[PDB]
Amino acid sequence: GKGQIISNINACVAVQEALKPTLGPLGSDILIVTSNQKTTISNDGATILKLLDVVHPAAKTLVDISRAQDAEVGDGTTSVTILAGELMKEAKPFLEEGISSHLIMKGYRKAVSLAVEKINELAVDITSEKSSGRELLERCARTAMSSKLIHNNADFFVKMCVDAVLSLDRNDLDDKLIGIKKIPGGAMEESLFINGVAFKKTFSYAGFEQQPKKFNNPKILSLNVELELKAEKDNAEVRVEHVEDYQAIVDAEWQLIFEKLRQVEETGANIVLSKLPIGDLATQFFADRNIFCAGRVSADDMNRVIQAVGGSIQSTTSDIKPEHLGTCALFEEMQIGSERYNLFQGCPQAKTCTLLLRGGAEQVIAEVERSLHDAIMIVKRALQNKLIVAGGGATEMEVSKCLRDYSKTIAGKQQMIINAFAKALEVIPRQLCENAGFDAIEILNKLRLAHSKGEKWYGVVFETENIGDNFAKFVWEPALVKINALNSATEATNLILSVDETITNKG
Amino acid sequence: IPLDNPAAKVLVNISKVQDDEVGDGTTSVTVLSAELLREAEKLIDQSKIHPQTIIEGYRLASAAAL
Amino acid sequence: RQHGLEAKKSHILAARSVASIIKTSLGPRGLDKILISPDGEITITNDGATILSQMELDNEIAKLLVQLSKSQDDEIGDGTTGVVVLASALLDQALELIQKGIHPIKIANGFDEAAKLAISKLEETCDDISASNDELFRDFLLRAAKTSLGSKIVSKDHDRFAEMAVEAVINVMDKDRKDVDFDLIKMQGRVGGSISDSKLINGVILDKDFSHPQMPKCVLPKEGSDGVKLAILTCPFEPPKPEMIDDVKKAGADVVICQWGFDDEANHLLLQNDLPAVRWVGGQELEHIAISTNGRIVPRFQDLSKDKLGTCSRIYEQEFGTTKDRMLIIEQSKETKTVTCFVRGSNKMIVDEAERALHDSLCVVRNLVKDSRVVYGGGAAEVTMSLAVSEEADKQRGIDQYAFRGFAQALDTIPMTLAENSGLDPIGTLSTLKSKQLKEKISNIGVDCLGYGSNDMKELFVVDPFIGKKQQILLATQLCRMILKIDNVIISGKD
C-alpha cells in the first residue's frame, strides 16, 4: 500500500542528506567508518555510496545509478543522486492528495525530453575564437583552484598541470594515467613535474651512498623471483656425527645462486625492479656495473613500468629476451624530506606520468591533491568534447525557467508536475551556496532578477557573494554531464516510485 | 594480597627499592608514606590546587629535618 | 546519526572532554599519569604522545588526534600537548558562533586568515641568534635538554648529556637542506648501569661477544692497511643441500656480519687468519652499520675490490659498567652520515624517559639551524600573538571581524593553561602580561611553570624555535578545519 511508499521517501532523503554537504568544491567532507576499520574521507558521491552498502532496495538504487554515472561519464556522481532524491520529496504531498505516482513519472519523461533540447541550444562550440592554444587549458585550471589555500601558489601549479595532459595523446585520456606521489615537508612552490613514473621508496635497508642520481642510459628489466637465498617458510635438517666433517657442512649454498648471474650479467640491464622486496644479498656489484636496484615496490607502480619503456615480466632468468629492455633520457633522485625518491625522466614511449606535490604536512597535501583532480577533469574534457555549457548555476536556473512557460500551454495534472520538477531543480544551486557559506535565501531572490532579462548565462560567483555571469569567471562544464544527469536521475526515480510494496526474504 | 587498585600497585614497586638498597625498616617506610597521604589529602580538598606546589614544600622541609 | 542539529554540539563536547585530559600535564610542572599496557607493564610519563597513542576508542572525532600526533613527532615532537589544547580553544570559541548563525566554513576560513597575519607580526619582533654571537648558539643547545630533564633525576647529570646532541646533529644534517633524518638516528638502551657512563658514539654500537674467546678484542691494522673493512651477509650460510678462501685475502675484509648464527667449527678457519665473525644481528641494526662506517655489502668474493670498501678507525671491546654482556665500541674519527644514540640507566623507566626526551632535543637543534630568527616562548608567544590579532580586528570589517576576536581569545587559552598548571590565577596573570607589553614597552614575558628567579626570560636566555612554534599553529588550524568540515558520523556494527 501507500505505507511502504512513504517509507521509501524518507529512505532516499537519508541517503541524499549525506551527499548534500559534499556537493561542490568548497563543500563539506563526510566521515564514514568501514568494517575494515580504515578511515575513508571523500567528497565524491561514487566512493561514498560504494562504502555504505545499504540493504534497502530504493537506497541501493541510488548507489547503483552512481556507478553508471561514474562509468559512462565519471563526473557528477554527487549531483545525480541529489537531483534524483529531490523528486521523492516533491512527490510526497502529491500522494496524499490522491494524485497517482504514474502520472508524476509520465510528466518527467516530457520534461526531460524538452530539457535535453535546450541543452544543445545553450552549448556553443568555440575553439580558436578569442582564445589561444596555450592559454585555453591554463584558464580552466585556475577556476577549480580558486578559493583554496593554493590560490597564491596556483601560478606555478597550472604550468605543471597543463604539461601532464599534453604529455599524453589527446585522443585517449584517463585520470588514472597521471600519478601523484605525496612528499612530506618542504615548500609548496618548489614542486616539479616529472615525465616518467615514480614510487614511494619504502626500502630502508643499508647500502646507501652509491647509485648516484645521475644516469646516462640505464636498461630496465622486470624481476619475478627473489634474489636472496633465505627461505622464509621451508627448511631442512641434516646432521653428521663426525668431528672433522663439521668444517665443510656449514659452508656451501650461495654457490647455487651463481647460476643466475651469467644469465643476468650478459643481458646488461641497469635497472632491477620487482613486485617482491629485494633482499640484502648484493647491493654492490650492481653499482659496480652502474646497475640500479630498488626493492619494496608496490605492484600498482610495476604496471606503469611496462607501459613506459615497453618491458616485460619473465619468471626465470633463462628465457629473458634482450629486446624487452628499455631506457629513459635522464634519471633524478631527491633526498628532500629525509627520504630518497626515485623517478624516471624523458621516456618517449611512456603512457603515464607522475606529478610530485610538496607541502607543510601530509594532511595539507591531501586537500591539495584532491582539489587538483577536479581541475584535471575540466582540462581533460576540454580537448575531448568541444561542446561546453555554462555551469555554476547558469544552466541549472534556465532549465527550470523554460519548464514554467511550457507548462502554461499544457493542461491537466502534468502542469503542476512539471512545475514541481522545475522547482526540484533548485536544490543543486541551493547546496552550492550553503556549503560555500553564502546565504541561499538572498541569492535565490536576487539571481532571479537578472535571470528574467533575457540572458541565460548568468551564474553564481563562487569567490565573492554576488550575482553575475560565469563567462568572466571561466567556469566551464561539458554538455555530456548535464544530459546524462537528467536521464540517470529520472530513471532511478521511476524505479522507486513504481514499487508500492517492498518484500525482503531472509535466508 | 592481590590488589585491583592501580594506585596501590605503585606502592609495591616503591617498597622494593628499600629492600634491595638496604633491606631494613621496609614497614616503617610504608607507614610513614601513608601518614604523608593523610596530611596531603587535607591540603588538596581544602585547596584543589596542583600538588606539585605542595611537593616543593616537602623538599624544603626535608632539608631542615636532615 | 546526527546532521545539522546535534552534530555540531556533540563534536565540540566530545573533543573537549578528550583534550581536557592532557591540559593538566602541559609544561614542566604538569602532572604525570599512570598508564597500563595490555601486557601488564605500568608506564608513567609526561609526554602526551604516549598517552594519546595508547587510547583505543570508537569515537570518530577523537581519532583525528591520534593520526595527527604521529606526524608531529617527526616534524617537531613538542606539538603533542600544545596543539591539542590550542585546537580545543578554537572549537570552544566556534561553538558560540554556531548559535549566532555563523557558517562553519567561515569559521574555518577565518582562522586561516587570522593565522597568516599573526605570523608576520612576530617577524618584526623576533631576534637573531647567529648575528648576536656564535657561542650563544651553542649555549642554547646545552640548555635545550636541561628544561625537559629538569623535573627528573637526570637533572643532576644533565651537564653530561648536553654535549652529546651538539656533535650528533652536525654529522647527520648538512647546512644545505638543514634536515635531520629519523631513520638515521639509532636509539638503543638497556636496563642496568648508570646514566654517567653514557658516551657519544659516531657509529653503530653492534653489541657482540666475539663468538669464540680466542678471537682478539681489537682489530689488527694488517700491515698498515687502510681502516677496518666489514662484510654484511644475510645469506643462510649452511651445508650443501639440494675456492672461496683464496678470494677473501684479496678484498681484505676484516670482519663478517650476519643476521643469523654460526656453528662452532665454522669460525675456526677464520680464527687463524685473525678474521672475526659476527652473528645474531637484527634486521634494523644492519642499516646503521654500512652507513656509519661507509662500508658496503659483499656481493661475492670473486668480484669484490678494495676501492669501495669502507674504512673506520678501529673496533674494540669496552665493558659498560657491571653488565656482563661486555659490549663494544666502534669508532670512526671522520664525519659520518648517521649517528647512534647511547642511553643507559639504572631503571627501565629511566631509560625510556631519557630516550624520548632526547628525540625532542635533536629536533630543536634542527629548527634553530633551519631558522635563525626565534621568539621567546613559555607563554610570551601566545600573548604577543593575541594583542596583534585583537588590535587588527577593529581595522578589518565584515564577518571576519568577529572571527579575529574569537581567534585572539582562543590564543589566550595556552598562557592561562600554563597559569592554571603553575598554581596561579589564570585571569590575574593574563592581565599582568598584557599590561607589561603595552604601557611599558614591547617585549616577551611568559608564565613560569617552574620556580625561577624573576620574570623576563630574556635575561635567563630562554629561547624557543620560531619555526617549531610556527608548525604548531599551522597544524592546529588544519586540525580545527577537518573537525568542522565533518557534519556526519557513520559507523557500522560489530559482529
CSV table of C-alpha atoms in Angstrom, one decimal, chain A residues 10 14-15 17-18 21 26-35 37 39 41 52 149 152 184-186 204-210 228-231 235-238 243 246-256 258 261 279-289 335-340 360-364 367 433-439 465, chain C residues 1 3-4 60-61 63-64 67-68 71 75 103-106 109 112 116 177 179-184 232-244 259-260 262-263 265-266 268-269 283 286-291 294-305 308-309 337 366 370 471 475 478 481-482 484-492 494:
chain,number,residue,atom,x,y,z
A,10,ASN,CA,12.5,9.0,3.9
A,14,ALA,CA,18.5,9.9,4.4
A,15,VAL,CA,20.9,9.0,1.6
A,17,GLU,CA,21.3,14.2,3.3
A,18,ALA,CA,24.8,12.6,3.4
A,21,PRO,CA,27.4,18.8,2.2
A,26,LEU,CA,34.1,24.0,-1.2
A,27,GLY,CA,31.6,21.6,0.2
A,28,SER,CA,32.0,19.7,3.5
A,29,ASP,CA,33.5,16.2,3.7
A,30,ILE,CA,31.8,13.2,5.2
A,31,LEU,CA,33.5,10.7,7.6
A,32,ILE,CA,32.5,7.0,7.1
A,33,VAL,CA,34.0,4.1,9.1
A,34,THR,CA,34.2,0.9,7.1
A,35,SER,CA,34.0,-2.5,8.7
A,37,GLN,CA,38.5,-0.1,10.4
A,39,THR,CA,39.4,5.9,7.8
A,41,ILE,CA,37.1,10.6,3.7
A,52,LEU,CA,27.8,2.3,2.6
A,149,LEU,CA,44.9,27.6,0.1
A,152,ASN,CA,48.7,32.2,-4.0
A,184,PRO,CA,56.0,15.3,3.3
A,185,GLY,CA,57.8,18.5,4.2
A,186,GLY,CA,59.2,21.3,2.1
A,204,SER,CA,65.1,1.1,4.5
A,205,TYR,CA,68.0,-1.4,4.1
A,206,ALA,CA,71.6,-0.3,4.1
A,207,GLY,CA,74.0,0.0,1.1
A,208,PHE,CA,73.4,3.8,0.5
A,209,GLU,CA,75.9,6.4,-0.8
A,210,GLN,CA,76.2,4.6,-4.1
A,228,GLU,CA,68.1,-13.6,-1.7
A,229,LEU,CA,68.6,-17.3,-0.8
A,230,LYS,CA,66.9,-17.0,2.6
A,231,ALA,CA,64.0,-19.4,2.9
A,235,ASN,CA,63.8,-25.7,5.8
A,236,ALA,CA,65.9,-28.8,6.1
A,237,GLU,CA,67.7,-30.8,8.8
A,238,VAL,CA,70.9,-32.8,8.1
A,243,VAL,CA,84.1,-34.1,14.3
A,246,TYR,CA,81.8,-30.1,10.9
A,247,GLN,CA,84.1,-27.8,8.8
A,248,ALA,CA,82.5,-28.0,5.3
A,249,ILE,CA,78.9,-28.8,6.4
A,250,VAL,CA,78.5,-25.2,7.3
A,251,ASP,CA,79.7,-23.8,4.0
A,252,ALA,CA,78.2,-24.1,0.5
A,253,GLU,CA,74.8,-22.9,-0.5
A,254,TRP,CA,75.0,-19.5,-2.3
A,255,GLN,CA,77.2,-21.1,-5.0
A,256,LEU,CA,73.9,-22.2,-6.5
A,258,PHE,CA,75.9,-18.0,-9.2
A,261,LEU,CA,74.5,-14.5,-12.6
A,279,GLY,CA,67.0,-8.8,-0.3
A,280,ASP,CA,70.2,-7.7,1.5
A,281,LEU,CA,72.4,-10.1,-0.6
A,282,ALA,CA,74.1,-7.9,-3.3
A,283,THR,CA,73.7,-4.1,-3.2
A,284,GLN,CA,77.2,-3.6,-4.5
A,285,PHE,CA,78.1,-5.5,-7.8
A,286,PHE,CA,75.1,-3.7,-9.4
A,287,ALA,CA,76.7,-0.4,-8.5
A,288,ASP,CA,80.0,-1.5,-10.0
A,289,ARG,CA,78.3,-2.2,-13.3
A,335,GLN,CA,66.6,13.4,-0.7
A,336,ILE,CA,64.2,16.2,0.3
A,337,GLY,CA,62.0,15.1,3.2
A,338,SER,CA,64.6,12.8,4.9
A,339,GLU,CA,63.6,10.2,2.3
A,340,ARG,CA,65.1,9.3,-1.1
A,360,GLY,CA,53.9,21.5,5.1
A,361,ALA,CA,52.1,18.4,6.3
A,362,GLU,CA,50.7,15.2,4.8
A,363,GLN,CA,47.1,16.2,5.6
A,364,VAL,CA,47.6,19.6,3.9
A,367,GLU,CA,43.4,18.5,0.3
A,433,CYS,CA,25.7,28.4,-1.7
A,434,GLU,CA,25.1,26.9,1.7
A,435,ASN,CA,28.3,24.7,1.6
A,436,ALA,CA,30.3,27.8,0.4
A,437,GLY,CA,28.9,29.9,3.3
A,438,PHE,CA,26.8,32.2,1.2
A,439,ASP,CA,23.1,32.7,2.1
A,465,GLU,CA,28.9,36.7,-3.0
C,1,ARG,CA,23.2,9.7,13.0
C,3,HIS,CA,23.2,16.1,10.9
C,4,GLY,CA,22.7,19.9,11.1
C,60,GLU,CA,35.2,9.2,15.3
C,61,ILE,CA,36.0,12.8,16.4
C,63,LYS,CA,40.6,9.7,16.0
C,64,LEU,CA,42.0,12.8,14.4
C,67,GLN,CA,46.6,10.4,13.3
C,68,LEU,CA,47.9,14.0,13.7
C,71,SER,CA,53.4,13.2,12.1
C,75,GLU,CA,58.5,17.2,12.3
C,103,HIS,CA,28.7,29.4,8.9
C,104,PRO,CA,31.2,26.8,10.0
C,105,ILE,CA,33.4,27.2,6.8
C,106,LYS,CA,33.6,30.9,7.6
C,109,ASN,CA,38.4,30.2,6.7
C,112,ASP,CA,43.4,30.7,8.3
C,116,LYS,CA,48.7,34.2,8.4
C,177,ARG,CA,68.9,21.2,3.2
C,179,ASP,CA,67.1,18.4,7.6
C,180,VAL,CA,67.6,15.5,10.1
C,181,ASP,CA,66.5,12.0,9.1
C,182,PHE,CA,64.7,10.0,11.8
C,183,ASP,CA,65.8,6.7,10.2
C,184,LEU,CA,69.5,7.7,10.6
C,232,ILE,CA,77.5,-7.9,5.8
C,233,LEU,CA,75.9,-11.2,4.6
C,234,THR,CA,72.3,-12.2,5.2
C,235,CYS,CA,72.6,-15.3,3.1
C,236,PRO,CA,71.7,-18.5,5.0
C,237,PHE,CA,75.2,-19.9,5.3
C,238,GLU,CA,74.6,-23.6,5.6
C,239,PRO,CA,75.6,-27.1,4.4
C,240,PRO,CA,75.4,-28.2,0.7
C,241,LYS,CA,71.8,-29.3,0.5
C,242,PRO,CA,69.6,-29.7,-2.6
C,243,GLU,CA,87.7,-21.9,-3.8
C,244,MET,CA,86.4,-19.2,-1.5
C,259,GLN,CA,71.8,-11.9,10.6
C,260,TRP,CA,71.7,-15.5,11.9
C,262,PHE,CA,77.1,-19.7,13.1
C,263,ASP,CA,78.4,-23.1,14.1
C,265,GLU,CA,83.7,-25.2,13.9
C,266,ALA,CA,82.9,-22.7,11.2
C,268,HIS,CA,88.0,-21.8,13.4
C,269,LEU,CA,89.2,-21.3,9.8
C,283,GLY,CA,67.5,-6.6,10.6
C,286,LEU,CA,72.2,-3.6,9.7
C,287,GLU,CA,71.1,-0.2,8.4
C,288,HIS,CA,73.5,1.8,10.6
C,289,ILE,CA,76.5,-0.5,10.0
C,290,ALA,CA,77.1,0.3,6.4
C,291,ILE,CA,76.2,4.0,6.6
C,294,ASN,CA,80.9,3.8,4.9
C,295,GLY,CA,81.1,0.1,4.1
C,296,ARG,CA,79.3,-2.0,1.6
C,297,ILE,CA,77.5,-5.4,1.3
C,298,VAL,CA,79.7,-8.0,-0.3
C,299,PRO,CA,78.0,-9.4,-3.4
C,300,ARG,CA,80.7,-12.2,-3.7
C,301,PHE,CA,84.4,-12.8,-3.0
C,302,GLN,CA,85.3,-13.0,-6.7
C,303,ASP,CA,84.3,-9.6,-8.0
C,304,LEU,CA,84.8,-7.6,-4.7
C,305,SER,CA,87.5,-5.0,-4.8
C,308,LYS,CA,84.7,0.9,-2.4
C,309,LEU,CA,85.1,-1.0,0.9
C,337,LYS,CA,76.1,10.4,7.6
C,366,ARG,CA,67.4,21.3,13.5
C,370,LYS,CA,67.0,26.0,9.7
C,471,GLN,CA,54.5,24.5,12.8
C,475,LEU,CA,48.6,22.0,12.5
C,478,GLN,CA,44.5,22.4,10.0
C,481,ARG,CA,39.1,22.8,10.0
C,482,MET,CA,38.9,19.0,9.5
C,484,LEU,CA,34.2,21.4,11.4
C,485,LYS,CA,34.2,20.1,7.8
C,486,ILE,CA,32.6,16.8,9.0
C,487,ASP,CA,29.0,17.2,9.9
C,488,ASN,CA,28.1,13.5,9.7
C,489,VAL,CA,29.0,10.4,11.8
C,490,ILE,CA,28.5,7.0,10.2
C,491,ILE,CA,29.8,3.7,11.7
C,492,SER,CA,28.7,0.1,11.3
C,494,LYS,CA,30.3,-5.3,15.5
